[PDB]
Write a protein that holds these residues in place. Structure first.
Motif, PDB file in Angstrom:
ATOM      1  N   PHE A  93     -47.182 -10.111 -19.964  1.00  0.00           N
ATOM      2  CA  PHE A  93     -46.223 -10.987 -19.307  1.00  0.00           C
ATOM      3  C   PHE A  93     -45.412 -11.834 -20.284  1.00  0.00           C
ATOM      4  O   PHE A  93     -44.195 -11.689 -20.396  1.00  0.00           O
ATOM      5  N   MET A 136     -51.105 -12.447 -10.228  1.00  0.00           N
ATOM      6  CA  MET A 136     -49.669 -12.333 -10.417  1.00  0.00           C
ATOM      7  C   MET A 136     -49.068 -11.843  -9.104  1.00  0.00           C
ATOM      8  O   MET A 136     -49.801 -11.426  -8.193  1.00  0.00           O
ATOM      9  N   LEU A 150     -46.434 -15.719 -12.468  1.00  0.00           N
ATOM     10  CA  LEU A 150     -47.798 -15.619 -12.951  1.00  0.00           C
ATOM     11  C   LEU A 150     -48.454 -16.978 -12.847  1.00  0.00           C
ATOM     12  O   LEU A 150     -48.064 -17.908 -13.535  1.00  0.00           O
TER      13      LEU A 150
END
Length: 153
Positions: A93, A136, A150
């Motif tokens: 991420f 997420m 997230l």
């Protein structure tokens, strides 16, 4: 059972029994929760997101391209791809938001710091307080663009 926004079903043209969430747009095979009621939600949480904008975006402009020319459809096929790499493990991420997030938060792994149920656009907010620490979400639409939130705290 299942926490807030968690439903089950099977995706089109393929019989897969899985778990969907209409608030988050998070999809997974594993079951979301395993007897504790009255819980609800904390009164302040911390997130991070990777925002990819399109043409019908509020400010069709970001630090990566002075004038956004891509379309929702394009911007969406794009977030999916990033979702693809996040879940596979090809990239993480942070590393992604850092390199592509059409949001000023890129220069911060995509962090936005904890906020309360009032500072964000409902679509984001609702998906943040519906994510459990660590979980997420899928694509989330706000007037900014398409997000990938997230939950960190």
């Amino acid at each position: 059972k299942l926490p807030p926004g968690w439903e089950k079903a099977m995706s089109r043209s393929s019989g897969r029994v899985y778990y969907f969430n209409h608030i988050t747009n998070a999809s997974q095979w594993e079951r979301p929760s395993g007897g504790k009621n009255g819980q609800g939600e904390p009164a302040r949480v911390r997130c991070s997101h990777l925002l990819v904008k399109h043409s019908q975006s509020r400010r069709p402009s970001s630090w990566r391209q002075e004038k956004i020319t891509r379309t929702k459809e394009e911007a969406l096929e794009l977030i999916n791809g990033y979702i693809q790499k996040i879940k596979s493990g090809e990239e993480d991420f942070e590393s992604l938001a850092s390199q592509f997030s059409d949001c000023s938060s890129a220069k911060a792994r995509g962090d936005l710091g904890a906020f309360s149920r009032g500072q964000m656009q409902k679509p984001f907010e609702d998906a943040s307080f519906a994510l459990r620490t660590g979980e997420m979400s899928g694509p989330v639409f706000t007037d900014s663009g398409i997000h990938i939130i997230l939950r960190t705290e």
